[PDB]
Structure 1
């Protein structure tokens, strides 16, 4: 239901966004992200129905609203728990049969291991084919990355890299 709108002319307000993006149907929420310095803003426009958002994308994508031409995406959104002072690794190319527990059992014996989460489809409960592992130490996360890079888990090679450094 959420569209990302990019390359927004900085003079464009929420009210101006509403008069264009209403073209798809009733809007539940508009949120413009004002740059506090950049030449353009971006926004999130949320509809009640997926069908409505698609109309707005279809109709308005690549069009001049004022000075800049508008770039619309379906917004990638996630819900993730977090822990302070941790060093997190992305772990991709996960076999669809790999769950948090399988991932845990693959990294737990490495020094400073904290947690592992597979990224789940919010509606279906299917694996997105990637996840994250957390460590309390940067050198130890580095150690786990070097040791598990390309290594096979449930038939598939692990793709690892820093998520936030």
Structure 2
């Protein structure tokens, strides 16, 4: 029922890493980390879709602007 935008990520941060960091907040329906077709590597951005809206809200409150590796993560909303 709720989708978030995750950005400003380190190029080596995997989907499995994102799942591990975001999953403790609530049940996740789908995670899609955007990849480069040419020179196969992460684009630094993606979308995490929580089953619950209040669970997605707490994930944003606790992860937005906080450093994962050394790059401060940018967690936001959509549409």
Pairwise TM-score range, normalised by the shorter structure:
0.7 to 0.9
Aligned alpha-carbon RMSD (Å): 1.3
Aligned to 1:104: 19
Please list every run of 5 or more consecutive structure 2 residues that lacks an aligned counterpart in the other structure. none
Larger Rg belongs to: 1
Tell me the distance in 2 between the aligned counterparts of 1:100 and 1:117: 7
Match of 1:122 among 2, 22, 37: 37
Tell whether the 8 Å contact from 1:104 to 1:115 is kept in structure 2 after alignment.
no
Which of 138, 144, 149 lines up with 2:64 in the alignment? 149
2:4 aligns with 89
Match of 2:55 among 119, 140, 163: 140
Higher relative contact order (CA 8 A, sep 6+): 2
TM-score of the two chains, using structure 2 as the length reference: 0.87
Runs (4 or more) in structure 1 with deviation over 6 Å come to none
SS in 2 for 1:97: coil
